[PDB]
Amino acid sequence: MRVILNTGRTIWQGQAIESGKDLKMYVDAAAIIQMNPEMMKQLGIAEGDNVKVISEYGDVVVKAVEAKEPLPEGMVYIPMGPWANRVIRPYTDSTATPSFKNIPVEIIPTDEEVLDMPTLMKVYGKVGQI
Amino acid sequence: MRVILNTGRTIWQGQAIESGKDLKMYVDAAAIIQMNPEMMKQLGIAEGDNVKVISEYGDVVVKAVEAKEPLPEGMVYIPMGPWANRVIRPYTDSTATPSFKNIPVEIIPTDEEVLDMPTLMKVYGKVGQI
Amino acid sequence: AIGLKAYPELCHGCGNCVIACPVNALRSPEVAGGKGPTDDVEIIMIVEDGVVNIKNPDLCGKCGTCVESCPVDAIRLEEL
Amino acid sequence: TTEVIEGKNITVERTNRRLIFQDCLCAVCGLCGEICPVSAIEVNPTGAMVRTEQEKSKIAIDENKCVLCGMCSSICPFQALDLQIDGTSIKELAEYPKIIKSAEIDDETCIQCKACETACPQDAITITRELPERKDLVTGEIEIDKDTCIYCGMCEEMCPVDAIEIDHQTPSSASPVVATDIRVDEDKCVHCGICKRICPVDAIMQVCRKTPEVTGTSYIDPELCVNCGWCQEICPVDAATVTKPFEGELIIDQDTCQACETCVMVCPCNVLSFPKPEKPGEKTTKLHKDERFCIYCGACERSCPVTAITVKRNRINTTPIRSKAWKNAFDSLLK
Amino acid sequence: CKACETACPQDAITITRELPERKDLVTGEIEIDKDTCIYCGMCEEMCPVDAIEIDHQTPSSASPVVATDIRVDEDKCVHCGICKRICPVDAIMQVCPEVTGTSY
Amino acid sequence: MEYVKNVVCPFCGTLCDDIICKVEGNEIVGTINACRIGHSKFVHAEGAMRYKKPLIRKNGEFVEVSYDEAIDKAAKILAESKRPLMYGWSCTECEAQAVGVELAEEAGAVIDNTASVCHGPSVLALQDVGYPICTFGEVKNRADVVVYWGCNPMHAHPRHMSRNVFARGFFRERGRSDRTLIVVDPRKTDSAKLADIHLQLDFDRDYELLDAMRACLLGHEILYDEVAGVPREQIEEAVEVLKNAQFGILFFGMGITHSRGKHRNIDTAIMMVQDLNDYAKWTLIPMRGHYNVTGFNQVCTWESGYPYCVDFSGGEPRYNPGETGANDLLQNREADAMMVIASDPGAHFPQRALERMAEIPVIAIEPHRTPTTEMADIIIPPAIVGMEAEGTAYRMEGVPIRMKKVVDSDLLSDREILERLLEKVREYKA
Amino acid sequence: GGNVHGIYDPAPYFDITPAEIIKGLAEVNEKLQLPHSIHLHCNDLGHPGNYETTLASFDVPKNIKPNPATGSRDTVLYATHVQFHSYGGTTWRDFVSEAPKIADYVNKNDHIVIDVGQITLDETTTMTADGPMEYDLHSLNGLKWANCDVELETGSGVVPFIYSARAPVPAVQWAIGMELFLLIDNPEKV
Numbered sequence A, B: 001m002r003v004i005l006n007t008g009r010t011i012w013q014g015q016a017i018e019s020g021k022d023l024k025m026y027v028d029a030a031a032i033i034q035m036n037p038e039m040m041k042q043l044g045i046a047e048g049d050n051v052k053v054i055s056e057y058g059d060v061v062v063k064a065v066e067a068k069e070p071l072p073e074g075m076v077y078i079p080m081g082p083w084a085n086r087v088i089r090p091y092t093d094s095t096a097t098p099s100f101k102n103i104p105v106e107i108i109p110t111d112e113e114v115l116d117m118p119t120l121m122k123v124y125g126k127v128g129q130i
Numbered sequence C: 001a002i003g004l005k006a007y008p009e010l011c012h013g014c015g016n017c018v019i020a021c022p023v024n025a026l027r028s029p030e031v032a033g034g035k036g037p038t039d040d041v042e043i044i045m046i047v048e049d050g051v052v053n054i055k056n057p058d059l060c061g062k063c064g065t066c067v068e069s070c071p072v073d074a075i076r077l078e079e080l
Numbered sequence D: 001t002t003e004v005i006e007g008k009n010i011t012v013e014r015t016n017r018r019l020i021f022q023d024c025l026c027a028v029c030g031l032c033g034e035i036c037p038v039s040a041i042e043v044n045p046t047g048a049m050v051r052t053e054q055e056k057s058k059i060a061i062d063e064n065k066c067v068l069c070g071m072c073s074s075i076c077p078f079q080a081l082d083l084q085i086d087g088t089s090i091k092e093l094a095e096y097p098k099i100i101k102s103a104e105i106d107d108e109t110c111i112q113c114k115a116c117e118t119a120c121p122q123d124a125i126t127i128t129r130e131l132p133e134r135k136d137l138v139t140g141e142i143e144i145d146k147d148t149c150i151y152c153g154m155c156e157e158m159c160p161v162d163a164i165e166i167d168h169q170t171p172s173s174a175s176p177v178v179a180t181d182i183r184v185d186e187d188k189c190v191h192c193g194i195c196k197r198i199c200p201v202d203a204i205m206q207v208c209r210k211t212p213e214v215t216g217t218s219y220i221d222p223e224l225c226v227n228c229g230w231c232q233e234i235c236p237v238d239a240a241t242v243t244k245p246f247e248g249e250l251i252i253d254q255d256t257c258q259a260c261e262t263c264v265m266v267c268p269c270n271v272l273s274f275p276k277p278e279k280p281g282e283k284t285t286k287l288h289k290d291e292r293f294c295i296y297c298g299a300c301e302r303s304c305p306v307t308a309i310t311v312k313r314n315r316i317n318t319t320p321i322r323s324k325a326w327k328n329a330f331d332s333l334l335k
Numbered sequence E: 001c002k003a004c005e006t007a008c009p010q011d012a013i014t015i016t017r018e019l020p021e022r023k024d025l026v027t028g029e030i031e032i033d034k035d036t037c038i039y040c041g042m043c044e045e046m047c048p049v050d051a052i053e054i055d056h057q058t059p060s061s062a063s064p065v066v067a068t069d070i071r072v073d074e075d076k077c078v079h080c081g082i083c084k085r086i087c088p089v090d091a092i093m094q095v096c097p098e099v100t101g102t103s104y
Numbered sequence F: 001m002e003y004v005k006n007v008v009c010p011f012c013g014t015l016c017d018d019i020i021c022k023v024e025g026n027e028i029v030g031t032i033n034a035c036r037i038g039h040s041k042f043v044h045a046e047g048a049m050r051y052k053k054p055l056i057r058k059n060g061e062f063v064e065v066s067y068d069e070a071i072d073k074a075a076k077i078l079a080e081s082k083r084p085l086m087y088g089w090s091c092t093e094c095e096a097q098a099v100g101v102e103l104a105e106e107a108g109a110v111i112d113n114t115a116s117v118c119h120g121p122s123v124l125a126l127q128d129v130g131y132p133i134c135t136f137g138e139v140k141n142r143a144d145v146v147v148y149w150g151c152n153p154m155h156a157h158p159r160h161m162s163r164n165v166f167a168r169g170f171f172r173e174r175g176r177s178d179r180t181l182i183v184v185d186p187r188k189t190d191s192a193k194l195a196d197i198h199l200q201l202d203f204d205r206d207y208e209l210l211d212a213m214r215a216c217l218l219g220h221e222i223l224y225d226e227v228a229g230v231p232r233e234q235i236e237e238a239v240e241v242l243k244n245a246q247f248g249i250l251f252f253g254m255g256i257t258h259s260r261g262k263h264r265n266i267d268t269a270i271m272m273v274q275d276l277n278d279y280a281k282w283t284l285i286p287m288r289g290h291y292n293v294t295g296f297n298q299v300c301t302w303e304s305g306y307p308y309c310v311d312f313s314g315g316e317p318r319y320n321p322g323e324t325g326a327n328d329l330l331q332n333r334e335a336d337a338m339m340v341i342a343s344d345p346g347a348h349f350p351q352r353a354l355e356r357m358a359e360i361p362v363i364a365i366e367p368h369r370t371p372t373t374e375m376a377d378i379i380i381p382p383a384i385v386g387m388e389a390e391g392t393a394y395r396m397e398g399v400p401i402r403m404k405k406v407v408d409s410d411l412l413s414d415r416e417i418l419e420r421l422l423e424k425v426r427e428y429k430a
Numbered sequence G: 001g002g003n004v005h006g007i008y009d010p011a012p013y014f015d016i017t018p019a020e021i022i023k024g025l026a027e028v029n030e031k032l033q034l035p036h037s038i039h040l041h042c043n044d045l046g047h048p049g050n051y052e053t054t055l056a057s058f059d060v061p062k063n064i065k066p067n068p069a070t071g072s073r074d075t076v077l078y079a080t081h082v083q084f085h086s087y088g089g090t091t092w093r094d095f096v097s098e099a100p101k102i103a104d105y106v107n108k109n110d111h112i113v114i115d116v117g118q119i120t121l122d123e124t125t126t127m128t129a130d131g132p133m134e135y136d137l138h139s140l141n142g143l144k145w146a147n148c149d150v151e152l153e154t155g156s157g158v159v160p161f162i163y164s165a166r167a168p169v170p171a172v173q174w175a176i177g178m179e180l181f182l183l184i185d186n187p188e189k190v
């Protein structure tokens, strides 16, 4: 289904970045998609089920969680981090600042696993430069 | 989802009762739930998907179809027949006439199958009397 | 060119188009007064085997009266 | 000779001559098809094009046959066909026969009643009028003694124009009052005296103590106007004058008509109607006409599937036609 | 006056009142000459209380008029005199109970 | 191929009598003029079961028996029952219905027709406040205002609008153009799509809307700004359209008989129609369902004095809808046996009534396989009225028209089956 | 929704008076040599002062000669329930019996047989093919009203009615019928 992706802070994502972006708690805080219970019923999913998020700019697998901060109808929330930044709009409109918030995306349930932090970064294929 | 169930005639249900209530065309005309496209979008279903309908009086599985005769917001329509009569209000208010129209019901998507005419009637458990 | 076209699979056989048509009404007093024809007549269309059936398409003036009388879009005026 | 399609509009151009067809102005009368000396035009059915949804244009112009003579542009009573020679329309070139017709409003006589704007069947008229502000049609003075006022709210409720406003509030120990202010909007007040009479403590002082001219303008759109004469007939002061393109006659056979309403809907001049009986059991004319509004375009006759209505055309108003080809074409439309 | 009803912190008070009818708080006479009226609609537009009603219509060949009647609702009229002053043909002639209730 | 003209359609209360049947041999293979529904009744659908012989249930299996054996077992059930229910009747002819009334007297039964699930609330209303009606020809020839209130004729009485609205009449020679068509329904039905005025009111609030219309008609103010989702100004305008009619007709259906208030919705509509006669000529016609539901209530009334829910347990007839109706007797578990004729309560009664049908002997006088035959102990197949058997039927406004026998059947008519059943019940009672 | 008042008032469109219908149908009856005569329920039923309309109606077919093929009828007019057609006065307040004038006409004329339509003083039901009279009765007593207008042919109405002995109008109505039976000399006319 087509939804609007909003991204930003959570206190839990804050605690995780300061504890360690190499820990399991960062995957648990930032590789997630918050949604209203009504949207979870439309998709036929439950908390803890994985979701494939696709935009014009990329793709990512994140874990569904029920939103404790209610969303307007048709909006979802992925906390800021490398999972969110696989799919948001990179273009700056000649300002230097990308479009991190309110991007149209396609979401469907998936049996694929969420990628941990080092594995997710391998999608970019870093080539050693020295 | 909580909705209002209305029931009655369709020209297709009329053609089917006169052709044969033992034919597949009767299941296709009367074991259905007509809904506005906006309600199908809210539930996360498409035409041809099955719906479990539960009231205070009973339960039934019917096939969702888009309404060609638009409904007011929050109303659904099951054509008259034994599928509709599993869930409408039996009480006559001391008039002899049951409440066949405008009953509150709960509707959810289901993977269960629609029951054909002889199989649906087995829910009543007829015991031979001779 | 533009002409009369039936979609019998959408038709209820209600007879609104048959009665509304001024050509049919002029040719059959029974049709003019809302009945299906009993006397043998040559009209544009009739309800036969439960659905609209075009019999004499050359008599149609493509006025659009039948089209306004059908709520299910089972009789139309279009490029044939 | 080529052709350019812009939605439903058609352009036939040769290199300079350019014929433009505007689908939105076409009444589907069929006259362009009848006049064309090389039969380059085919007009779709009148009733179908008016009463149903169609993707096609109302007419089709064959490029291989059209010679850009301009006869179709000249005869069109609806300004839907325009032939341009080196950028100028044939209506501005005296060598091309032109149909004599007009429609005007005398602004000195006009009283801006707007009846012609309502009656015009093609919405071609715009009548503007400047009414004075309401405060300039009433005279008086009003004031509320706020110390005497007990904020009962009766003036606010009864005021017929909602000119009175009270700033209501729930009292508190710091502000032990049910309201903090009351105001009259003097631009809304009509000095009816209701508020001063309902006030239970006589807190309101209201006293009643040459009206400006209603100015306006008129405008007739020459592209939309079809010279039906409805404005001339409806005007109560005879300020509107109209001259028609053709003269003729309408003949209706009431027994052949089956009252399908096609001609009534098709007529661009609102000539035809279905009168309602005044009393139960009375009978009326099945199809009623008023030829004061008819332009003899022929659309009604063309639309009727039972041919119950026919149009006779006795004259096409022009000065004497010099060209024999044009004279013969115009004469063929008389019947 | 209802001030006690508003002020009561426990919402224990009910104050009702029957206001006089609007017509009993104004005095005048009003009449439209329908033969002189040209149905310009200026009185209907300007009337501050919508007391004037015109039966507007699209003309037809059987009824070649823009309206069939004009009426003043005397129960709504507040005798402001706006209509008589705007009329362009002078078709309009216009010239100029205690509060009960319950307390509980 | 032969063409049989002036045939009467045995389906809805419109009771069209201009049907043409296409007959090849002894089989109706097609029609002319009948709508999609009427045509479906006349022609046989490939694969549909048409019983050739009576059947009796043994365990979950059925065994073919003769008419003698089936009628004898049915008679024994009726004779030994203390509260037998004899239900249906609306899809058979008046002579068979009259034998039914005599059989209900003999068995001390309750006799009831489909009116108890249909226009029975209209019958309760007309008994309290009246019945101002006319025949179809008066609508065709005079009506300038036509109202369809809580009925969808395009789907349920398919030729009704073409016969009464689009028809050109004596004083309405322009047909559709001489009439203001009003439809009152919470849905945008295919009938509402043709209307000049569609009052798309809130469901279950017809009674409230009608109260506002009646108060307005009698010169009073409407208390609320909106009633049943219709603004005050639009209610006042609808009332003016009704008051300005030269001849108005109010057609009504299941939208007001089945919904909240039932008979009281009809009662208030009837009283509005009556009071409208001080301003304009007004009448009403209930959109009676089956082609002969009307005939049962006529026959039952003229023979007993009461139209439906008639109890003969005490010898003298007694009438109490809410106590003696089919759904009351089944849902309150009072009936100890049920005979069904020319009806399908298996398909069309609520679940609570079906639960009782599962526990008591059920006799079905029925030609085809249905949910009722799935719940039956005895099935007796008849020749079909209007195709294979003749007799009177009554149209929705009471016009009697004789049904025709178009083709021959080796099966007994309903009338013949009921006469044999009456003789056997008399024998068992003795 | 209307009615006719007296025998010279036509219905809308048809433009034929009640007097012309009565006279024409009496002539049809004797041209067909029918066993019984025309059987007439007069215009203006149940209204104070209707006795003048009744006497005028009785004279309408008097110059038509009876000619039955079967039986021995020798009268051209049969007037039914004449009690309801024998009322004097102008309103229900000054209502009086005019049965002696009606009985005097029957005694002196040889072309008429009547039936009385005697009030029994019961709670009963009215039912006639006089549609507007039935609506008017419902408008007076407020009781349940049924109606049926039959296309090209006739009309009808039904209303319950209580004739109480203690009420003034039913008491006079009972007396009228008794006067008709008792003041008509020859029972061969009743």
Ligand SMILES: Nc1nc2c(c(=O)[nH]1)N[C@H]1C(S)=C(S)[C@@H](COP(=O)(O)OP(=O)(O)OC[C@H]3O[C@@H](n4cnc5c(=O)[nH]c(N)nc54)[C@H](O)[C@@H]3O)O[C@H]1N2
Pocket (backbone or CB within 6 Å): B006, B007, B008, B009, B010, B011, B012, B013, B014, B015, B017, B080, B101, B102, F012, F037, F118, F149, F150, F151, F152, F153, F155, F156, F157, F184, F185, F186, F187, F189, F202, F203, F204, F205, F206, F252, F253, F254, F255, F256, F259, F260, F287, F288, F289, F290
């Ligand atoms: N196709 C077909 N035709 C038949 C039959 C059949 O089984 N099939 N059976 C026949 C029988 S027995 C009968 S009684 C007739 C019945 O024919 P109708 O009286 O037309 O019956 P329904 O289609 O049940 O319902 C009519 C309308 O009531 C509306 N409605 C629902 N609730 C309300 C409400 O609160 N207010 C109002 N105003 N309307 C409401 C519904 O939306 C519906 O469109 O059809 C007859 N014809």
Ligand SMILES: Nc1nc2c(c(=O)[nH]1)N[C@H]1C(S)=C(S)[C@@H](COP(=O)(O)OP(=O)(O)OC[C@H]3O[C@@H](n4cnc5c(=O)[nH]c(N)nc54)[C@H](O)[C@@H]3O)O[C@H]1N2
Pocket (backbone or CB within 6 Å): B007, B008, B009, B017, B079, B080, B081, B084, B085, B088, B100, F090, F091, F092, F114, F117, F118, F119, F254, F289, F290, F341, F342, F343, F344, F345, F347, F348, F349, F365, F366, F367, F368, F370, F382, F383, F384, F385, F414
């Ligand atoms: N949910 C819901 N339920 C409803 C309704 C609704 O609107 N909603 N509507 C109700 C109403 S108004 C009604 S009337 C009922 C429908 O009323 P039913 O009587 O249940 O309708 P049918 O299914 O048409 O049943 C008629 C039966 O008669 C048989 N038959 C036909 N011709 C003959 C004959 O000549 N002789 C005999 N013996 N049998 C014959 C047919 O095969 C058919 O099985 O449904 C009611 N149930």
Ligand code: SF4
Pocket (backbone or CB within 6 Å): C010, C011, C012, C013, C014, C015, C016, C017, C018, C047, C051, C052, C069, C070, C071, C072, C073, C074, C075
């Ligand atoms: S085409 Fe439309 S109007 Fe004509 S019979 Fe079929 S459904 Fe009725």
Ligand code: SF4
Pocket (backbone or CB within 6 Å): C004, C020, C021, C022, C023, C024, C044, C059, C060, C061, C062, C063, C064, C065, C066, C067, D305
């Ligand atoms: S288009 Fe006009 S003429 Fe042709 S069938 Fe329809 S109504 Fe009749």
Ligand code: SF4
Pocket (backbone or CB within 6 Å): D025, D026, D027, D028, D029, D030, D031, D032, D033, D043, D058, D059, D075, D076, D077, D078, D079, D080, D081
């Ligand atoms: S002449 Fe008639 S048909 Fe041809 S363009 Fe002008 S309006 Fe259209």
Ligand code: SF4
Pocket (backbone or CB within 6 Å): D019, D035, D036, D037, D038, D039, D040, D041, D061, D065, D066, D067, D068, D069, D070, D071, D072, D073
């Ligand atoms: S310009 Fe001359 S040739 Fe071309 S279409 Fe018009 S009339 Fe025919």
Ligand code: SF4
Pocket (backbone or CB within 6 Å): D105, D109, D110, D111, D112, D113, D114, D115, D116, D117, D127, D234, D235, D236, D237, D238, D239, D240
């Ligand atoms: S109708 Fe006459 S006065 Fe009124 S606006 Fe038009 S031209 Fe002016």
Ligand code: SF4
Pocket (backbone or CB within 6 Å): D144, D148, D149, D150, D151, D152, D153, D154, D155, D156, D182, D198, D199, D200, D201, D202, D203, D204
């Ligand atoms: S009516 Fe008088 S006291 Fe009451 S609010 Fe108005 S001015 Fe104040």
Ligand code: SF4
Pocket (backbone or CB within 6 Å): D142, D158, D159, D160, D161, D162, D163, D164, D184, D188, D189, D190, D191, D192, D193, D194, D195, D196, D206
């Ligand atoms: S004078 Fe009349 S219009 Fe002005 S404030 Fe008082 S009540 Fe309102």
Ligand code: SF4
Pocket (backbone or CB within 6 Å): D103, D119, D120, D121, D122, D123, D124, D125, D220, D224, D225, D226, D227, D228, D229, D230, D231, D232, D242
């Ligand atoms: S002549 Fe006819 S079309 Fe032209 S402005 Fe007057 S009313 Fe309008």
Ligand code: SF4
Pocket (backbone or CB within 6 Å): C022, D256, D257, D258, D259, D260, D261, D262, D263, D264, D287, D303, D304, D305, D306, D307, D308, D309
């Ligand atoms: S004249 Fe022809 S088009 Fe006009 S209403 Fe009569 S039949 Fe229809």
Ligand code: SF4
Pocket (backbone or CB within 6 Å): D250, D266, D267, D268, D269, D270, D271, D272, D293, D294, D295, D296, D297, D298, D299, D300, D301, D311
């Ligand atoms: S009535 Fe006159 S103006 Fe109207 S369509 Fe016919 S010819 Fe053209």
Ligand code: SF4
Pocket (backbone or CB within 6 Å): E001, E002, E003, E004, E005, E015, E103
């Ligand atoms: S007691 Fe009466 S006057 Fe005093 S505050 Fe309450 S409502 Fe006003």
Ligand code: SF4
Pocket (backbone or CB within 6 Å): E032, E036, E037, E038, E039, E040, E041, E042, E043, E044, E070, E086, E087, E088, E089, E090, E091, E092
């Ligand atoms: S202002 Fe004068 S002319 Fe205009 S509508 Fe009112 S009364 Fe009539």
Ligand code: SF4
Pocket (backbone or CB within 6 Å): E030, E046, E047, E048, E049, E050, E051, E052, E072, E076, E077, E078, E079, E080, E081, E082, E083, E084, E094
């Ligand atoms: S006096 Fe004032 S309120 Fe009365 S009608 Fe004229 S304008 Fe309207």
Ligand code: SF4
Pocket (backbone or CB within 6 Å): F009, F010, F011, F012, F013, F014, F015, F016, F033, F034, F035, F036, F037, F038, F039, F157, F158, F159, F160
């Ligand atoms: S409308 Fe009813 S009676 Fe007429 S053909 Fe169709 S089903 Fe048969």
